[PDB]
Structures are given as C-alpha cells and as structure tokens.
Amino acid sequence: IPKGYMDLMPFINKAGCECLNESDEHGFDNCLRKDTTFLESDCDEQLLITVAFNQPVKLYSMKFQGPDNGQGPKYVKIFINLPMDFEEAERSEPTQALELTEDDIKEDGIVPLRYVKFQNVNSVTIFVQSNQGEEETTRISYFTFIGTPVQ
Amino acid sequence: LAVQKVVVHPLVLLSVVDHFNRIGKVGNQKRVVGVLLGSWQKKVLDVSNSFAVPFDEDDKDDSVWFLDHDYLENMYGMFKKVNARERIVGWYHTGPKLHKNDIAINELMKRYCPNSVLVIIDVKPKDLGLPTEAYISVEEVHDDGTPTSKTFEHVTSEI
Amino acid sequence: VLESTMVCVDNSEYMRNGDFLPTRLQAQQDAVNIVCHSKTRSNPENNVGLITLANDCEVLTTLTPDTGRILSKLHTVQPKGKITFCTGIRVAHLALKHRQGKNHKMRIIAFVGSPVEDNEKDLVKLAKRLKKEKVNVDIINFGEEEVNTEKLTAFVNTLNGKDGTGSHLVTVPPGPSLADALISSPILA
Amino acid sequence: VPGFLQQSQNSGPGQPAVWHRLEELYTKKLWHQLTLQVLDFVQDPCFAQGDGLIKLYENFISEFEHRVNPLSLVEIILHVVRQMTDPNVALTFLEKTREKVKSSDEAVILCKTAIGALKLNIGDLQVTKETIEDVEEMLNNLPGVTSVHSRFYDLSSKYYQTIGNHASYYKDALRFLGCVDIKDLPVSEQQERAFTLGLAGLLGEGVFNFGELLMHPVLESLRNTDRQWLIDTLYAFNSGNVERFQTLKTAWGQQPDLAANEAQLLRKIQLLCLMEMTFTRPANHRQLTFEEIAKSAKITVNEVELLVMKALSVGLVKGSIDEVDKRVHMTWVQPRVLDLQQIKGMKDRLEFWCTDVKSMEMLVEHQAHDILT
C-alpha cells in the first residue's frame, strides 16, 4: 500500500457488501480475498459491485485486479454514496470513470483515484461496463480500496 | 371548481429542487414525487411546505409505480406536530410535463386529501413561465357518449 | 437472515373457491400469518410488507417491523378481478428497492392462486432482471398448478439458475390447508 | 340435494359429458371456475327454450349462491328469468334476487336494470322512471365504466323511445355505443341502432351538433344500406341545406317518425341553415340581409325575424337584428366540427398571428431597449 494510506478492506462491512449479477460458484466473499478465487458473473460480463463502509472513509487508490485471460475489467465506473439498476450505469455520471488497462488489472497494478471526489464515502458501487477480451463473463481479484478513514 | 388559485411558497420550490438534486443524484434523473402541505383560505390554496416520499416507476410501463404511503403518514404526523395548521393539500412531481400515471397517483393521494391538488414544479429554469402548474382531478363528462373519465383540470398558480 | 420481504397476496376471483379449506382467500390469510411471523423470529430487524395481485396491483403496506398491521390489511382484502403476475413482482420489486435499510436482502413471497396469462418470454425476461438485482421471490404454486407448473418452472429455473437455492417453487397439491405445507417448505427453513 | 346433477349425469337435458365436467368442479369445490362453465351452459344452444333450466336454479345454483361473485350471480339469473314468462312472479324472483346481491353495488344495478326491462314490457312507465331515476343516481357513484353500464343505457334508451323523448334518447343511446365495443355487436343490431340514433338527432330538441354524430362509427354501417338516405339527410342538416332536405323528402317522408314531425324538422334545418350562413361568411361581412336568410332557408322575409329569435334564444348564434335595414348583425356562431383541410387553414391564420405578435415583441424590445429591465 502507498505510504500514509492503508488497505481499507478490513474497514468495510463484509456482512453488508452486496453484489449484483454474481455467479454462485465464485462470489463477493471470494472477491475480497487475496487468493485465486474470483467473482465471475452469470447474466453477462457486465456486473455491478456494491460496497458499504462501516465508517466514513476516503479512497485514495484501488486495486481492482482481474486475470489476464481477457476476463479482467476494461471499463470501471465508480459511484459514491447513491441514495443502480444496470440501466443507470448505461446513462449516468460516474464519480471517476476508469479504463482499467492491462497494467492496471494485473496482480501488481494499482489504479489512481481522484482523491478530490473520494473524501466522504460511506458506500461505494463499482460497475464493470466492459472487459478486455470481449468475453461472455468477467473475473475479479482482491478488489480493495486504499485510503484513510475520515475520522 | 373546488380550487380557484394555488399559491406556492418559495420554501416549496427550494424543497422540491433540493428533493430533485438529492434523489436525482448520481443514481438517476427521473421525476421525484413528494407530498404538499398547506392551508385553505376561502377558495385559494396556500401550499407552504412539502416533504419527499419514496417513489419509483417503470420507464416503459406506466401502470407499474410505487409510492411509500406509510412513509407519507409517518412524516405527516411528524410535520403535524410542528405545525398543526398545515395539512396535506396534494402532491408534487418535477416531471417537465404530466404523465399518464398521475391520475392513478392522485387517487392514492385523494385518500389523504379529497380535493388533492397536483403541482408540477419544473426544476429546470424555464425562461418565461412560472415553474408551477397546478392541476385538480375532475370527472369529464363527454357529450360524444364516451364514458366519463378522470382528468386533470388546470388551476391558475401563483408564487 | 437480515432480509426484507414482501408478500404478493392474491385477491382474484378464484380465491373464493373452497378448494383449500375453507376458502382460498381464508387459506392464504392463515398462510400469510405464518410466513410473516416466521420472518420476524428469524431476525427482529426483518421487514415485511403486503402487496396485492388484483386487476391492478396495490401496495397495501410497505416494509415495516410489525406483524399485526399485515394481518390487519389482509382482513379487508376481498376477492375481485384477475391476477396480474407480471406487474405485481415489479411493483413489489420497486418497494424492495426503497427499503428502510439497504443492508437487508431482497425477498418476495408470491401467492399465485390464478393462472399467469402471458407468454413464457415475458416470465423469462422478468427473472433475469430479478437475478441481476439479486432479488429472490419464493412462489407458492397452489390453485391452478395443473397449468402453472411450466410457466413458473421457467421463472425459478432462470432466476435460481444452476445451484441457486435462492427462490423455491413450492407447489402444494389441494388438501386440508396450504399453510400446513409451509412449515415443511424450504421457504421458512 | 345434488341428485339433480346425478339425475342429469345419465339422462339429462344437456350433454351428459357436460354435466360430468360440472360435477367434477363441485367435488373439487372450484366455486368460481364452475360459474364460467355454468355461464357457458346457461346459454345452452340446445335446450335454452326448454323449461328444464328453471329447476337448475333451486336444485343447483341456489345451494352455492352464498359464495359466488354477486355480479356473476346476477346475469346468470337474467337468462334463468328469460326461460320463465310469467311477468308478476318474475318480479318477486328479482326482488329476492335483488336482496341477496347487496354487497356488490354493480350487482344491484344489474338487478334493477333487469326489473326495468321486464316492467317496460308491461307498460308501467311511471314506476320505470322511479327505478330509472334511482339506478342512474347510483351508477354515477360507481367509478369508471363497467359491464352493467351498457345494459342500463339500453334500457334507458328503450324507455325514452316509448315516451317519445328523442332528445334524451339521443343522449342515452350515445352512452350505449360508448360503453361497448362497436365490432362485437351484430351488423343487424349495428344498422338498426345507428338509424334510430340518427333519427333521434333530427327529432331531438336542442340536438344541433350534427358534425359529431356524422363521425360516429356506428353510422358507417349504413353506407351501402338502403337506409343511406338518413346519412344523406344528416349531411343536409349538418350543412344547413334545406334545399337538399326538401329534395330528399321522397326518402325521409316514408319513415313514419320523421314524416309525422316534418314541421319540427323543417324548423331545425332552418336554424342550422342560419348557422351555416354565419359560419361561412367572414367576420368582416357577418351582416346578413333578410333576403339572404329568406332565400337560403326557404322562408318568407316576414318569417326571418322569428327564425333568428329561436337561434338567438337557444344560443345557436349570437348577434342582433336590424329590422329597419332588414339586416342581422351576427357576432358569434356555435363552434362546429372542422375537416383536416379547415384545420390547416386555421393553423395558417396562427402563422400570421404569431408573426404579428413576434413583430411587436421585437419592436418594443428594440425601441425600449434602454429602459428594459
């Protein structure tokens, strides 16, 4: 993790982090884990993550990793503190639309975030619009947000 | 009719705009629906406060729509305690024009106020007209023989 | 579990039949009483609400951590009109999206007591939208299961999918009481 | 008690297989689902005329009447009372039938509509009004349009036809065609109902909006019929063509109702001829002489003044009469139905009107630019 900003994965409510269009065999619990197990989808490669934090938290950077087989993300739209139906992601204003490149999606790439727009984040939803190889489904890895609590 | 004029106060316009800006956040940009509060003086309505209610509808089908009417009663009692003289006089929605399903929503609101007045409050800053369009439900008796139907009749609105 | 539920009661004309003792409407009133109580004891924060499946769907009560008002509303429910299963789930889905607590899990209880009069394509596309939104609807196939066993099969199979265990399609044959089959049903398990 | 069903199981007036299907519903207690089967059987295409279906009431349906939809219970009795022909005891059948269906208001409407239909047959017109003034009051309370609306208007229209009120028959028969789909009705019923409605419009009091009637889809059933002359006659009234009306007298004079009230008919078209003269002429030249009214309406100049009084008193037209100059100053006409072409012409006036408003809007803005806020 970058100096001065911790890995916020333990901070989040594991019981309360829901996922949308997630294949049962690999789910959100396996997504947050550092191990090989992923979060694949069933309906389409399109997928909607929802992440609710325990306490107010700032997001400095994220590590939304995916396998380099092509199922990794190539278009991530991040939404902050929504008062999301797979049609809003089609037409809305993301906090920071992110084209996660192959370097960004590997096991070592971190994705910088606009720290200006990520300051008071009680709940965050990340949407995978498109993957890299135009496959039917996607796959994720230990998607963790790097930052500090609001305090 | 039962309503001669609807006077909408600047607090309602600011509240309705704030309702739209906080629900119509990064979530979506549909119309938001709330509940209008005000008093009655002779035959001129005096819309003076409002509170938001949870509401959703289908973009395609007009018969599919949800309004948290239990939320309506809970906050009305919350508002009645502070200001008892301010009762429900109707509902509002920020839709730029009327919708096919408003006549159904007014029926839901007609239980809490028999002479419910719908006021369309355009959040967009229209250049020439007032943002408020006050409507009341009337039973239009057609002379062609077509069966009597529930329609909205325009009521002159003033800020 | 911490989940919010809506019961999709039926008040169509067919609920006047005495196929379920004494009346299908009275049978479902007891049945709703049991599912509504069952969710309350699973977790005191459970939210339950009542929606009708009449000619036009009507939300009688939104989610509330109360049980008596659910039976208070079902008391006045009178049989009238025809089932509209297509719009009932969506309207119940809308109320779920506006729950008091976003941490709760989606859940709908459907009491189909009249045939679903639409093409199988409409039921199939409806399930995918619920599955995308992680919405689980437990449907009880009492009444006219001789004709509804195939349309609802496409619902649960598409919604649950491979190894779903999220929505069950419990079909009770006509008997003494459909509620007596609910305590052994996976809905309350 | 179900022995009558068992009796008809083997040797029954209907098809024994049909009773077997009805039998299964009773054991399965599909109380509503039997009604659809029962409705399919009450209109039995074999023994509807035979008197075996009256016992179907006391033996079969009186047993399970306590838990059947009240609205569906009533029209099932309507065809039961159809089989019986005794008038007086049919009432006590329906008064008893009226009582049991009390929770459903629509069921009450159908019951009172039924007793009015049979009572109109016996000619007790006075108490039909008392019923008809009561069922009409209730039906407004019921929201929307329901399946009992149509049967009421059919009875209500049939009532006014007997008395002779063409005006209210016109109003009520319009409601009938507005409460049922046009396609469903038989062509013979379509043709007959359109004709008597058009006949009522000519004969009605205050029925001057003939353009809206002319577009009623029920009249399209009379395009090729031998009764096309009514449509041609209605065209004359809409256009205010008294010359066509007298020319068509060889046709409408044969109908007893129109011929008997020709003097009243000639007065109506003369009034409509007055509106046509006013409507056709531009607002600059709406000063009609007595000669034009006399010539166009086929009346003597001395009768022109009284003609304008009826038009002015009813409200068809607005204006004043200048008797010294033999001229009528016309200021307003009842708005009428316009074709698409005339609507195009109306919009063309709006284009000129829009330009004039915009022209001075830019004129005041330009001239008063310094002081404009």
Q: Where are the domains of chain C?
A: 2-185
**Contacts of residue D294, Cβ cutoff 8 Å, sequence gap at least 6:** D300, D301, D303, D304
Q: Which residue has the tokens 């039962």?
A: B2
Nearest to B68 among C90, C91, C98 (CB): C98
**Contacts of residue D209, Cβ cutoff 8 Å, sequence gap at least 6:** B143, D334, D336, D337
Distance CA C33, CA C106 (A): 20
Residue C73 burial by Cβ neighbours in a 10 Å radius (0-12, 13-18, 19+): middle
Distance CA D338, CA D229 (A): 23
Number of Cβ within 10 Å of residue D10's Cβ equals: 8
Closest CA to C49 of C38, C60, C33: C60
The side-by-side arrangement of strands in the sheet containing D317-322 is D287-289, D327-333, D317-322
For residue B149, list chain D residues with Cβ-Cβ distance below 8 A: 144
As a dihedral over the C-alpha atoms of residue D204, residue D210, residue D216, residue D220, rounded to 10 degrees, the angle is 100
**Alpha helices, DSSP H, located in chain B:** 10-23, 69-82, 102-110
For residue C2, list chain A residues with Cβ-Cβ distance below 8 A: 15
Helices and strands: H and E segment counts in chain D: 20, 3
E strand or H helix that includes residue D214: helix D210-214
Distance CA C95, CA D281 (A): 61
Contact at 8 Å (CB) between B34 and B51?
yes
D326 domain residue, yes or no: yes
Interface of D with C in 24-63 (CB under 8 A): 28-33
CA distances from residue D131 to B113, D101, D116, D171 in whole angstroms, order as listed: 34, 17, 7, 19
Whether residue B146 and residue D176 make contact (CB cut-off 8 A), yes or no, is no
Whether residue C56 and residue B63 make contact (CB cut-off 8 A), yes or no, is yes
Contact at 8 Å (CB) between D172 and D200?
no
How close does chain B come to A69, measured CA to CA in Å? Answer: 32
Whether residue C17 and residue D68 make contact (CB cut-off 8 A), yes or no, is no
Backbone angles phi, psi at B22, to 5 degrees: -100, -30
How close does chain B come to A114, measured CA to CA in Å? Answer: 16
Closest CA to D115 of D148, D138, D71, D81: D81
Distance CA A31, CA A50 (A): 12
Nearest to B145 among D143, D144, D178 (CB): D178
Nearest to A43 among C2, C105, C131 (CB): C131
Backbone angles phi, psi at B56, to 5 degrees: -155, 155
Closest CA to C141 of C131, C128, C155: C155
Are 3 or more Cβ–Cβ pairs between D and B shorter than 8 Å? yes
Q: Which residues pair with A145 in a beta bridge?
A: A62
Residue A12: strand, helix, or coil: strand
Closest CA to C178 of C9, C64, C41, C24: C24
Distance of CA D289 to the CA centre of its chain: 39
Q: From chain B, which residues contact C within 8 Å (Cβ)?
A: 54-58, 61, 63-71
Distance CA C112, CA C148 (A): 9
The side-by-side arrangement of strands in the sheet containing B5-7 is B149-155, B132-140, B117-121, B87-93, B33-41, B44-52, B5-7, B157-158
Q: Strands D317-322, A47-63: parallel, antiparallel or unpaired by DSSP?
A: unpaired
Distance CA B11, CA D336 (A): 46
E strand or H helix that includes residue C52: strand C47-52
Peptide bond before residue C173 is cis, with ω within 30 degrees of 0 = no
Distance CA A105, CA A72 (A): 6
Distance CA D325, CA D321 (A): 9
Distance CA A77, CA A57 (A): 19
Q: Which residues pair with D289 in a beta bridge?
A: D327
Q: Where are the beta strands (DSSP E) in D268-312?
A: 287-289
For residue B28, list chain A residues with Cβ-Cβ distance below 8 A: 88, 92
D29 domain residue, yes or no: yes
Contact at 8 Å (CB) between C10 and C53?
yes
Whether residue B66 and residue C98 make contact (CB cut-off 8 A), yes or no, is yes
Given a contact as 3+ CB pairs under 8 Å, which chains touch A? B, C
Distance CA D159, CA D127 (A): 11
Distance CA C185, CA D215 (A): 61
Whether residue B143 and residue D145 make contact (CB cut-off 8 A), yes or no, is no
Distance CA D306, CA D312 (A): 10
Q: What is the resolution of this structure in A?
A: 2.9
Whether residue D176 and residue B143 make contact (CB cut-off 8 A), yes or no, is no
Residues in chain A: 151
Contact at 8 Å (CB) between C149 and C173?
no
Number of Cβ within 10 Å of residue D86's Cβ equals: 9
- Transcribe A73-136 into DSSP letters: EEEEEEEES----SSTTTSS--SS-B---HHHHSSS--EE--TTT-SSEEEEEEEEEEESS--S
For residue D67, list chain C residues with Cβ-Cβ distance below 8 A: 16, 18, 23
Interface of D with C in 292-351 (CB under 8 A): none
How close does chain C come to B155, measured CA to CA in Å? Answer: 29
Whether residue B27 and residue A95 make contact (CB cut-off 8 A), yes or no, is no
Distance CA C15, CA C11 (A): 6
Distance CA B145, CA B138 (A): 17
For residue C10, list chain D residues with Cβ-Cβ distance below 8 A: none
Q: Which long-range contacts (CB under 8 A, 24 or more apart) does B121-126 make?
A: B121/B8, B121/B12, B121/B13, B121/B16, B121/B17, B121/B92, B121/B93, B121/B94, B122/B94, B122/B96, B123/B16, B123/B17, B123/B20, B123/B21, B123/B94, B124/B96
Per the structure, the count of domains in chain D is: 1
Distance CA B37, CA B91 (A): 8
Whether residue B27 and residue A82 make contact (CB cut-off 8 A), yes or no, is yes
Residues in chain C: 189
Q: Which residues pair with A18 in a beta bridge?
A: none
Rounded to 10 deg, the angle between the D147-163 and D166-179 helix axes is 160
Domain spans of chain B, in order of start: 3-159
Comparing alpha-carbon positions, the chain D residue that sits nearest to B107 is D143
- B148 DSSP 8-state letter: P
For residue C61, list chain B residues with Cβ-Cβ distance below 8 A: 70
For residue C17, list chain D residues with Cβ-Cβ distance below 8 A: 29-33
Q: Structure solved using which method?
A: cryo-EM
Contact at 8 Å (CB) between C170 and C187?
yes
CA distances from residue B45 to B119, B122, B154, D316 in whole angstroms, order as listed: 11, 19, 14, 37
Given a contact as 3+ CB pairs under 8 Å, which chains touch D? B, C
Residue type, D318: K
**Contacts of residue D214, Cβ cutoff 8 Å, sequence gap at least 6:** D234, D235, D238, D337
Distance CA A20, CA A87 (A): 13
Residues in chain D: 373
> Which of A20, A25, A87, A88 would best serve as a mutation to test chain C binding (most C beta carbons within 10 A)?
A20
How close does chain A come to C171, measured CA to CA in Å? Answer: 25
Residue C41 burial by Cβ neighbours in a 10 Å radius (0-12, 13-18, 19+): exposed
> Which of B146, B149, B151 would best serve as a mutation to test chain D binding (most D beta carbons within 10 A)?
B146
The side-by-side arrangement of strands in the sheet containing C137-140 is C59-64, C47-52, C3-9, C105-111, C137-140
Both tokens assigned to A9: 């994965």
Distance CA C178, CA C24 (A): 9
Contact at 8 Å (CB) between C16 and D31?
yes
Distance CA B30, CA B24 (A): 7
For residue B30, list chain A residues with Cβ-Cβ distance below 8 A: none
Both tokens assigned to D202: 């000519």
Are 3 or more Cβ–Cβ pairs between D and C shorter than 8 Å? yes
Contact at 8 Å (CB) between A57 and A13?
no
Residue D257: strand, helix, or coil: helix
Interface of D with C in 66-105 (CB under 8 A): 67-69, 72
Distance CA D114, CA D134 (A): 13
Contact at 8 Å (CB) between D333 and D279?
yes
Contact at 8 Å (CB) between C107 and C4?
yes
Residue B150: strand, helix, or coil: strand
Backbone angles phi, psi at C17, to 5 degrees: -65, 150
Contact at 8 Å (CB) between C71 and C64?
no
Nearest to A80 among B26, B28, B59 (CB): B26
Whether residue B145 and residue D144 make contact (CB cut-off 8 A), yes or no, is no
Comparing alpha-carbon positions, the chain B residue that sits nearest to C51 is B66
Sign of CA dihedral D246, D248, D252, D254: positive
How close does chain B come to C92, measured CA to CA in Å? Answer: 8
Q: Chain A to chain B, count of Cβ pairs less than 8 Å apart?
A: 20
Are 3 or more Cβ–Cβ pairs between D and A shorter than 8 Å? no
Distance CA C11, CA C77 (A): 7
D143 domain residue, yes or no: yes
Backbone angles phi, psi at A115, to 5 degrees: -65, -20
Q: Does B147 touch chain D (CB under 8 A)?
A: yes
Q: Does B59 touch chain D (CB under 8 A)?
A: no
Distance CA D213, CA D201 (A): 8
Q: Strands C3-9, C105-111: parallel, antiparallel or unpaired by DSSP?
A: parallel
D119 domain residue, yes or no: yes
Q: Strands C47-52, C3-9: parallel, antiparallel or unpaired by DSSP?
A: parallel
Contact at 8 Å (CB) between C111 and C57?
no
CA distances from residue B149 to B155, D145, D179 in whole angstroms, order as listed: 18, 8, 12
Q: From chain C, which residues contact B within 8 Å (Cβ)?
A: 56-57, 59, 61-62, 64, 87, 90-91, 94-95, 97-98
Whether residue B63 and residue C64 make contact (CB cut-off 8 A), yes or no, is no
Comparing alpha-carbon positions, the chain C residue that sits nearest to D33 is C14
Distance CA C94, CA B66 (A): 6
D338 domain residue, yes or no: no
Q: Where are the beta strands (DSSP E) in chain B?
A: 5-7, 33-41, 44-52, 55-57, 65-67, 87-93, 117-121, 132-140, 149-155, 157-158
- Transcribe D337-361 into DSSP letters: ---HHHHHHHHHHHHHHHHHHHHHH
Residue D330: strand, helix, or coil: strand
Q: Strands B5-7, B157-158: parallel, antiparallel or unpaired by DSSP?
A: parallel
How close does chain B come to C139, measured CA to CA in Å? Answer: 20
What domain range is D109 assigned to? 1-330
Nearest to D30 among C17, C23, C79 (CB): C17
Contact at 8 Å (CB) between B7 and B47?
yes
Closest CA to D80 of D113, D109, D107, D58: D58
Whether residue C90 and residue B61 make contact (CB cut-off 8 A), yes or no, is yes
How close does chain A come to C100, measured CA to CA in Å? Answer: 12
Residue C124 burial by Cβ neighbours in a 10 Å radius (0-12, 13-18, 19+): middle
Radius of gyration of chain D (CA): 29
Given a contact as 3+ CB pairs under 8 Å, which chains touch B? A, C, D
